[PDB]
């Protein structure tokens, strides 16, 4: 099937949602942006630490950011404020045989 | 022929066009920008989910974004508002033999 | 000689120049910026399609963009407006033997 | 376990903290941003040289930057001003057997 | 020692300095930013051509840019104006045996 490696990923956030989600496939998030919304602060709690990964508002309607996770950790993605943001990314499954 | 891997890709959007297109070659989109136009909201419906990937306007005449798709999914690219945007990217066909 | 893979590339554009150039070495353009100039719209005609890859002006004196081409296509790079822009990039010659 | 290669990394800075830390795992920092804070200047002293890697303020509430370190050097990360910034990155452990 | 590949690199520029330097190790520059300074125009003369790679000022206190050089060329890095800028990057020594 040749090397695809990176397959499309997406995450639609609703105003003040918190998704504590485990990772079965390592992936990279590449952007978070709002179409409908006033303010969305994109927080990530991983390693039991609250990381502020992006602040995407009407003023900054799109935060293109380099995010990457591995299937070893269990992270929580949550947005504060009132806005609905769509994240985009790609699952990275790099294979080189053995 | 050596490793090219990433070959050039481009997509010219017209004001309020919706292209529901299948993927036979995995590719990365790297930028969406408008030359002629007032506003273009670049939406992507993949996995049956409306993702707002970029908002490119006269105010933000160019959104350089990290987009990547695989030949497994069937996505729809569509712009809202009135503007004509040109996306640019590269088809990633990484080969490492077997 | 070890793996260099990506070797330096550069392109100095003069106000309203059009270079229809073939590709013998696949390369990535990573930025277009103006030092002297008022406005430069960086267009790329490839696949016989006019792509607006960047709009770099005095207001936006530098457009860092992810561009990539392969030695299979023959593209034309041309800037509109009055400004002299310097593009920067790197030829990607990835080798992995056979 | 397949190729994960890049595993998630994060760094929460407090206003005017200096962490002189050794590297046992090579990693890339991809963003530094403030949620709470007025100003944070992100300095890095490596090779016994003070590098100003990013200036992230209330005005620029998020600096997405391409940082990369190797397990050979011993660096110091320190922020000046009053703000608490969260850095995000990923440890790059690329393996290709032998 | 596993694959480090990319090792940390940095370059502190003083107001109006010109470093004509040869490359013994291929590297990528990822950002140029000023902490102390009014204006720094980051020029690169390579292939005997003056490239304006970034314009980093008090207004634009940090230019995150994708720069890459190979150990084959001999380049000159020089900043104009009055400001002291710190560049950051990583030497890319990709090895895959033979």
XYZ file of C-alpha atoms in Angstrom:
490
model
C 0.000 0.000 0.000
C 3.149 2.161 -0.018
C 4.062 4.586 2.725
C 1.188 6.765 3.826
C 2.646 7.219 7.314
C 0.641 10.333 8.148
C -3.138 9.950 7.961
C -5.632 12.797 8.393
C -6.926 13.700 11.865
C -9.420 16.293 13.089
C -10.979 17.530 16.332
C -14.036 19.769 16.622
C -14.160 21.485 20.011
C -17.318 22.938 21.465
C -17.226 25.971 23.838
C -15.718 24.722 27.112
C -15.351 21.032 26.379
C -12.866 18.747 28.065
C -11.885 15.509 26.393
C -9.657 13.303 28.509
C -8.587 10.860 25.831
C -6.052 8.064 25.575
C -3.825 7.638 22.536
C -3.829 4.413 20.545
C -2.280 6.096 17.508
C 0.501 8.685 17.691
C -0.467 11.905 15.943
C 0.487 15.480 15.188
C -1.911 18.378 15.561
C -1.092 21.149 13.137
C -3.782 23.763 13.641
C -6.629 24.945 15.839
C -9.050 27.554 14.468
C -12.492 28.988 15.187
C -15.258 29.715 12.753
C -18.075 30.156 15.200
C -17.032 31.531 18.550
C -15.727 34.439 20.574
C -12.706 32.990 22.399
C -11.164 29.545 22.754
C -8.155 28.784 24.912
C -6.800 25.393 23.939
C -5.375 23.642 26.963
C -3.739 20.277 27.105
C -3.284 18.374 30.317
C -0.648 15.739 29.755
C 1.919 14.277 32.149
C -0.572 15.647 34.696
C 0.377 19.199 33.714
C -1.865 21.923 32.274
C -0.240 23.132 29.077
C -1.657 26.149 27.287
C -1.016 25.062 23.720
C -2.863 27.866 21.913
C -5.082 30.869 22.445
C -7.396 31.183 19.467
C -9.852 34.070 19.514
C -11.890 36.193 17.110
C -8.772 38.373 17.048
C -6.592 35.358 16.339
C -9.133 33.198 14.444
C -6.620 30.460 13.696
C -3.594 29.139 15.551
C -1.399 26.968 13.355
C 0.699 25.074 15.877
C 3.061 22.103 15.890
C 1.610 19.533 18.275
C 2.678 15.909 18.526
C 1.604 13.062 20.772
C 2.564 9.417 21.196
C 0.408 6.374 22.025
C 2.178 6.079 25.362
C 0.621 9.037 27.162
C -2.992 9.869 28.032
C -3.833 13.504 27.464
C -6.771 15.817 28.016
C -7.721 18.421 25.473
C -9.997 21.189 26.654
C -10.975 24.648 25.502
C -11.948 27.547 27.724
C -14.056 30.537 26.800
C -16.901 30.559 24.334
C -15.965 29.394 20.869
C -16.032 26.276 18.736
C -12.630 25.372 17.328
C -11.625 22.831 14.770
C -8.238 21.214 15.159
C -6.512 19.511 12.326
C -3.670 17.064 12.306
C -2.329 13.748 11.118
C -1.673 10.414 12.766
C 1.979 9.510 12.254
C 2.545 5.784 11.858
C 6.081 5.574 10.521
C 7.051 2.028 9.590
C 10.431 0.823 8.376
C 9.980 -2.918 8.726
C 12.566 -4.490 10.990
C 14.892 8.277 -10.543
C 16.041 8.906 -6.954
C 13.742 9.959 -4.154
C 11.390 12.750 -5.106
C 8.792 11.663 -2.547
C 6.970 14.993 -2.435
C 5.612 16.230 -5.763
C 3.974 19.627 -6.309
C 0.219 20.049 -5.791
C -2.118 23.017 -6.196
C -5.799 23.899 -5.810
C -7.493 27.027 -7.150
C -10.752 27.712 -5.319
C -13.485 29.888 -6.728
C -15.832 31.901 -4.433
C -18.089 29.353 -2.710
C -16.990 26.155 -4.398
C -17.322 22.712 -2.890
C -15.153 19.902 -4.175
C -15.988 16.522 -2.698
C -12.928 14.636 -3.866
C -11.435 11.221 -3.204
C -7.727 10.731 -2.594
C -5.677 8.412 -4.781
C -2.410 10.044 -3.726
C -1.626 11.146 -0.169
C -0.684 14.814 -0.015
C 0.122 17.760 2.206
C -1.427 21.176 1.740
C 0.902 23.903 2.918
C -0.865 27.156 2.124
C -4.123 28.777 1.087
C -4.078 32.398 -0.109
C -6.258 34.863 -2.005
C -5.243 37.245 -4.723
C -8.660 38.143 -6.006
C -11.377 38.065 -3.395
C -12.897 39.570 -0.285
C -13.198 36.607 2.102
C -12.623 32.869 1.850
C -13.283 30.429 4.659
C -11.583 27.156 3.839
C -13.607 24.265 5.175
C -12.805 20.613 4.968
C -15.387 17.933 5.502
C -13.590 14.699 6.223
C -14.594 11.763 8.420
C -18.038 13.315 7.876
C -17.027 16.303 10.005
C -16.851 19.970 8.987
C -13.370 21.197 9.827
C -12.560 24.879 9.505
C -8.974 24.584 8.335
C -8.309 28.257 7.555
C -9.936 31.654 7.339
C -8.210 33.630 4.612
C -9.487 37.145 3.987
C -8.304 40.449 2.531
C -7.131 41.119 6.089
C -5.357 37.772 6.207
C -4.521 37.391 2.483
C -2.595 34.166 2.993
C -2.931 31.306 5.453
C 0.133 29.078 5.492
C -1.148 25.918 7.144
C 0.041 22.352 7.672
C -2.526 20.070 6.061
C -2.039 16.392 5.301
C -4.303 13.750 3.822
C -4.013 10.054 3.022
C -5.421 8.041 0.096
C -7.701 6.207 2.507
C -10.203 8.970 3.229
C -12.545 10.937 0.961
C -12.653 14.613 1.805
C -14.543 17.688 0.684
C -12.823 21.012 0.298
C -15.045 24.060 0.140
C -14.666 27.787 0.596
C -17.306 30.154 1.908
C -17.565 33.868 1.296
C -16.500 35.672 -1.831
C -12.878 35.162 -2.767
C -10.733 33.000 -5.004
C -7.983 31.193 -3.117
C -5.051 29.215 -4.347
C -3.886 26.327 -2.217
C -0.473 24.864 -2.550
C 0.905 21.572 -1.395
C 2.789 18.425 -2.260
C 1.819 14.811 -2.756
C 3.857 12.671 -0.372
C 4.733 9.275 -1.802
C 7.421 8.005 0.541
C 8.938 4.740 -0.651
C 11.524 2.629 1.138
C 11.308 -0.562 -0.885
C 10.434 -3.572 1.233
C 29.956 12.255 2.100
C 27.118 11.415 4.518
C 23.549 12.548 4.059
C 23.231 16.195 3.148
C 19.923 15.635 1.353
C 18.816 19.265 1.480
C 21.186 21.760 -0.137
C 20.748 25.543 -0.045
C 18.702 27.301 -2.740
C 17.880 30.956 -3.375
C 15.951 33.121 -5.837
C 16.231 36.897 -6.180
C 13.176 38.347 -7.914
C 13.168 41.727 -9.578
C 9.961 43.852 -9.786
C 7.667 42.088 -12.270
C 9.899 39.273 -13.444
C 8.659 36.000 -14.852
C 10.936 32.987 -14.835
C 9.512 29.979 -16.634
C 11.974 27.385 -15.414
C 12.250 23.616 -15.596
C 13.256 21.524 -12.597
C 16.264 19.224 -12.741
C 16.521 19.060 -8.953
C 13.526 18.792 -6.620
C 13.490 21.587 -4.062
C 11.575 23.271 -1.277
C 11.098 27.016 -1.075
C 10.773 28.159 2.507
C 10.516 31.933 2.345
C 9.995 34.944 0.112
C 10.822 38.409 1.472
C 11.457 41.943 0.238
C 14.160 44.323 1.300
C 13.853 46.824 -1.486
C 10.371 47.185 -2.884
C 6.804 48.319 -2.390
C 4.743 45.227 -3.255
C 5.497 41.780 -4.640
C 2.862 39.183 -5.412
C 4.558 35.835 -5.846
C 2.736 33.776 -8.430
C 3.536 30.302 -9.575
C 2.198 28.859 -12.779
C 2.532 25.109 -12.606
C 0.350 22.374 -14.096
C -0.690 25.272 -16.353
C -2.440 26.933 -13.410
C -1.725 30.340 -11.863
C -1.155 29.790 -8.162
C -0.815 32.774 -5.861
C 1.742 31.363 -3.456
C 2.442 34.516 -1.429
C 1.708 38.210 -1.218
C 4.741 39.948 0.233
C 4.511 43.708 0.651
C 6.064 46.502 2.705
C 3.262 45.698 5.151
C 4.142 42.013 5.051
C 7.898 42.300 4.330
C 8.476 38.559 4.539
C 6.322 35.553 3.719
C 7.717 32.346 5.179
C 5.936 29.669 3.177
C 6.220 25.923 2.631
C 6.806 25.376 -1.077
C 7.981 22.149 -2.671
C 8.599 21.132 -6.260
C 9.730 17.978 -8.039
C 11.965 17.538 -11.106
C 8.983 16.231 -13.044
C 7.086 19.482 -13.540
C 8.033 22.742 -15.268
C 6.936 25.793 -13.334
C 6.942 29.544 -13.788
C 7.741 31.863 -10.935
C 6.737 35.475 -11.357
C 6.190 38.474 -9.131
C 3.731 41.282 -9.733
C 3.895 44.802 -8.385
C 7.034 46.759 -7.689
C 9.410 45.086 -5.280
C 12.489 42.896 -5.287
C 12.044 39.712 -3.278
C 14.517 37.104 -2.224
C 13.286 33.550 -1.943
C 15.102 30.970 0.041
C 14.872 27.225 -0.013
C 16.676 23.925 -0.250
C 17.008 21.275 -2.920
C 15.844 17.960 -1.486
C 17.766 14.994 -2.850
C 16.837 12.186 -0.486
C 18.797 9.016 -1.188
C 18.397 5.655 0.511
C 20.392 3.464 -1.843
C 18.343 0.632 -3.285
C 5.805 -1.176 19.153
C 6.218 0.467 15.729
C 7.858 3.820 15.182
C 6.694 6.479 17.592
C 9.960 8.413 17.304
C 8.560 11.697 18.595
C 7.003 11.567 22.061
C 5.178 14.463 23.731
C 7.115 16.998 25.820
C 6.041 20.047 27.817
C 7.547 22.786 29.985
C 5.621 25.128 32.275
C 7.644 28.246 33.065
C 6.943 30.455 36.036
C 7.698 34.231 35.952
C 11.498 34.564 35.992
C 12.537 30.952 36.370
C 15.861 29.550 35.263
C 16.207 25.839 34.659
C 19.744 24.730 33.907
C 18.983 21.238 32.682
C 20.946 18.461 31.018
C 19.554 16.479 28.103
C 19.228 12.708 28.283
C 16.708 12.629 25.437
C 16.962 14.772 22.303
C 13.835 16.846 21.771
C 12.172 19.553 19.730
C 10.318 22.461 21.282
C 7.558 23.684 19.019
C 5.806 26.426 20.951
C 5.950 28.725 23.955
C 2.779 30.555 25.024
C 1.368 32.421 28.014
C -2.054 32.125 29.531
C -1.397 33.889 32.784
C 1.218 36.598 32.590
C 2.234 40.004 31.323
C 5.558 39.361 29.559
C 7.872 36.386 29.169
C 11.183 36.501 27.348
C 12.314 32.960 26.676
C 16.078 32.740 26.836
C 18.227 29.728 26.267
C 21.805 29.539 27.408
C 23.497 26.756 25.512
C 27.101 26.404 24.352
C 27.602 29.003 27.102
C 25.758 31.584 24.997
C 22.559 33.467 25.851
C 20.129 32.892 23.006
C 16.867 34.805 22.920
C 14.657 32.117 21.437
C 11.287 33.866 21.791
C 9.594 36.927 23.205
C 6.082 35.975 24.239
C 3.943 38.723 25.736
C 0.281 39.608 26.241
C 0.640 41.250 22.826
C 2.177 38.097 21.393
C 0.450 35.504 23.632
C 1.980 32.551 21.813
C 5.276 32.033 20.020
C 5.264 28.919 17.864
C 8.954 28.285 17.285
C 11.137 25.498 15.913
C 13.522 24.482 18.683
C 15.629 21.337 18.735
C 18.167 19.984 21.190
C 20.380 16.911 21.402
C 21.394 14.799 24.419
C 24.969 15.978 23.994
C 24.605 19.547 25.237
C 23.488 20.971 28.589
C 21.213 23.958 28.223
C 19.519 26.478 30.474
C 15.999 27.635 29.821
C 14.908 30.802 31.561
C 12.169 33.370 31.173
C 12.413 37.040 32.042
C 9.583 39.393 32.875
C 6.387 38.468 34.635
C 4.412 35.735 32.942
C 3.900 31.995 33.103
C 4.519 30.272 29.784
C 3.868 26.752 28.682
C 6.235 25.253 26.156
C 5.321 22.285 24.093
C 7.463 19.906 22.141
C 8.383 16.329 21.387
C 11.343 14.131 22.199
C 12.797 12.810 18.950
C 14.209 9.309 19.269
C 14.660 8.217 15.673
C 15.730 4.588 15.402
C 16.621 2.694 12.245
C 18.226 -0.392 13.737
C 21.779 -0.900 12.546
C 24.371 6.408 20.505
C 21.074 6.193 18.588
C 19.934 8.748 16.055
C 20.350 12.312 17.217
C 20.665 13.618 13.656
C 19.814 17.219 14.509
C 22.065 18.869 17.090
C 21.509 22.344 18.550
C 22.981 25.406 16.819
C 22.938 29.110 17.665
C 24.213 32.424 16.298
C 24.348 35.713 18.198
C 24.554 38.666 15.813
C 25.802 42.065 16.854
C 24.510 45.280 15.168
C 25.958 45.296 11.640
C 28.158 42.225 11.746
C 29.180 40.213 8.723
C 30.331 36.646 9.166
C 31.613 35.042 5.988
C 31.717 31.456 7.178
C 32.286 28.082 5.562
C 30.138 25.069 6.385
C 31.683 21.873 7.710
C 28.360 20.649 9.093
C 25.031 21.021 7.289
C 22.477 22.832 9.423
C 19.029 24.367 9.573
C 18.361 27.797 11.019
C 14.888 28.010 12.475
C 14.638 31.468 13.995
C 16.220 34.897 14.255
C 15.057 37.256 17.016
C 16.168 40.420 18.797
C 16.130 41.143 22.481
C 18.343 44.182 22.493
C 18.151 46.264 19.356
C 16.149 48.571 17.139
C 16.326 46.912 13.709
C 18.159 43.937 12.240
C 17.976 42.920 8.604
C 19.326 39.407 8.265
C 21.082 38.999 4.952
C 22.719 35.921 3.587
C 25.190 36.019 0.754
C 25.460 32.546 -0.689
C 26.126 31.408 -4.255
C 27.524 34.953 -4.479
C 24.003 36.361 -4.155
C 22.631 38.666 -1.451
C 19.546 37.002 -0.023
C 17.366 38.891 2.424
C 16.343 36.002 4.641
C 14.545 37.966 7.371
C 13.767 41.451 8.585
C 13.563 41.380 12.364
C 12.799 44.667 14.091
C 11.357 45.965 17.359
C 8.045 45.760 15.494
C 8.781 42.196 14.440
C 10.959 41.118 17.408
C 11.294 37.546 16.182
C 11.386 35.985 12.731
C 10.882 32.233 12.839
C 12.172 31.116 9.456
C 13.074 27.853 7.738
C 16.726 28.090 6.737
C 18.904 25.191 5.646
C 22.497 24.971 4.487
C 24.821 22.205 3.334
C 28.561 21.705 3.941
C 29.194 22.260 0.246
C 28.614 26.009 0.067
C 30.320 28.932 1.811
C 27.878 31.555 2.995
C 28.005 34.964 4.621
C 25.564 35.944 7.311
C 25.255 39.630 8.057
C 22.777 41.910 9.762
C 22.098 45.523 8.880
C 20.668 48.201 11.121
C 21.176 48.472 14.840
C 20.095 45.425 16.787
C 21.537 42.261 18.268
C 19.773 39.128 17.062
C 20.036 35.570 18.199
C 19.546 32.874 15.607
C 18.690 29.364 16.528
C 18.934 26.184 14.553
C 20.145 22.619 14.390
C 22.912 20.847 12.528
C 21.384 18.035 10.484
C 23.644 15.006 10.203
C 21.330 12.308 8.899
C 23.018 8.915 8.771
C 21.570 5.686 7.417
C 24.697 3.565 7.236
C 25.381 2.276 3.747
